Amino acid sequence: SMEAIAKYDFKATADDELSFKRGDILKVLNEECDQNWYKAELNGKDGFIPKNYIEMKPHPWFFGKIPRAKAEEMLSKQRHDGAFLIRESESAPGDFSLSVKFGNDVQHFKVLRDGAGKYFLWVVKFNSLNELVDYHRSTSVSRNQQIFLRDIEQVPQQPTYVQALFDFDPQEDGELGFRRGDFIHVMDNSDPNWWKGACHGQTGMFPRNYVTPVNRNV
Amino acid sequence: GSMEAIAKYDFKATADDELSFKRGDILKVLNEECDQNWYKAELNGKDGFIPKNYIEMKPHPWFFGKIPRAKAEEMLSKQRHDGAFLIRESESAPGDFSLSVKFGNDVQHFKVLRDGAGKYFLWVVKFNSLNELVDYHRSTSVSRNQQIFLRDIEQVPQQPTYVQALFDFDPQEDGELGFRRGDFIHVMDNSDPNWWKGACHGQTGMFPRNYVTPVNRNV
Amino acid sequence: TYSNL
Numbered sequence: 001s002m003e004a005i006a007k008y009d010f011k012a013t014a015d016d017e018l019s020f021k022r023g024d025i026l027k028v029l030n031e032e033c034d035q036n037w038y039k040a041e042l043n044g045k046d047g048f049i050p051k052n053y054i055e056m057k058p059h060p061w062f063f064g065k066i067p068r069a070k071a072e073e074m075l076s077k078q079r080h081d082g083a084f085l086i087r088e089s090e091s092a093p094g095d096f097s098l099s100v101k102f103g104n105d106v107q108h109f110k111v112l113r114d115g116a117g118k119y120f121l122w123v124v125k126f127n128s129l130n131e132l133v134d135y136h137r138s139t140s141v142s143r144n145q146q147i148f149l150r151d152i153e154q155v156p157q158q159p160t161y162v163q164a165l166f167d168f169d170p171q172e173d174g175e176l177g178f179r180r181g182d183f184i185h186v187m188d189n190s191d192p193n194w195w196k197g198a199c200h201g202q203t204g205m206f207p208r209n210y211v212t213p214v215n216r217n218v
Numbered sequence: 219g220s221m222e223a224i225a226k227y228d229f230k231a232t233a234d235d236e237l238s239f240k241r242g243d244i245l246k247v248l249n250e251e252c253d254q255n256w257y258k259a260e261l262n263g264k265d266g267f268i269p270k271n272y273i274e275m276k277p278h279p280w281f282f283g284k285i286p287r288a289k290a291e292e293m294l295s296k297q298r299h300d301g302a303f304l305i306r307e308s309e310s311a312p313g314d315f316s317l318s319v320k321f322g323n324d325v326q327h328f329k330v331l332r333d334g335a336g337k338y339f340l341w342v343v344k345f346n347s348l349n350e351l352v353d354y355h356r357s358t359s360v361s362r363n364q365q366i367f368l369r370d371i372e373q374v375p376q377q378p379t380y381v382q383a384l385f386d387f388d389p390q391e392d393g394e395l396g397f398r399r400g401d402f403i404h405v406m407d408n409s410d411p412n413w414w415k416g417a418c419h420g421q422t423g424m425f426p427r428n429y430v431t432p433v434n435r436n437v
Numbered sequence: 438t439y440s441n442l
Contacts, residue, residue: 052312059436064437088402157435183281192431198313200332213379
């Protein structure tokens, strides 16, 4: 099982299919009832979806080395209060900041990191940035008003690829076959050992240690 | 250890032991990192120190994913030199690849075919991989009307790629990168299967790929 | 800026 992001709006064509909108996050189930379809669930509804309408899920809120200016840019456009992201300073490497939208402005918090490697905003110290974010999904980040962090509306990205290091003939069913050198579209890398991908018109599981990254360029 | 990286910015050397370079240059970076904030590097027969925070992981030079036919044309027609190219995978036929090449003021697209044995080919010559296909056609023309040879496009620095630590890592040697479970690590070199080069908490060094999981692109 | 100086 896996989550993916919708690249297009899909209106269901029969009653056993699942409608969705671009950018929705879909829970896809391991199986594929058709060669071109998955069964999937979304917002309390279940049905089939087409393989070629979904993309690997982007990270929901870690946004790398983007500047404070650009973060205000993308958070201004979000419809919902609490929309947030975390960014590294390209100035001070390794230091992080938290940008959140509330009303017609954008607040910036500095994430602190103590002698033990613990992160914090105020007093409570967290083992990781994930623990900070999830804490503040239900306790406000602001000391004046209730700001609860909410994932921004997500947009599907350009696809991520790997490249085969070795030939891989599939033994088991539902495994993806390829040849050394082949470029593989990656659909799910959430698991440390077995990833879901596509090549030569097929989809399936393959072992990550048979492939090497293809670094982004567009 | 040793790695190629791409310059994010122009850099004029500030001392005679430093190396000047321009944005988009591919630098060879040495395993002998000789200062906290500086790598030793080579570029076109020159060498010197370069600032760590001026360089990015090298992007793939010619495989461009499912870039549409129109965007490929726009990207290529702006290139300065003929034979500039990329490979792309079709958006409507998954698994099928096309080679797009700049022919003067036109862009031309060639459908790469795959036989029953996994060999790729355009006309007569068969290849074991798109890499072999590309390398053949760097020195043999990709057309029989005229003499066109494949040339990498103008390389451009991209937004950084990150991984995330699955476990704590405690370095034993100086050139290794320490981190805690959950830390986001800026990836500088991922071309070796077992040991990757990265940055976090203001340090750079090597770490085992086994300790980390991908952070998927979003910007 | 920063909301926690």
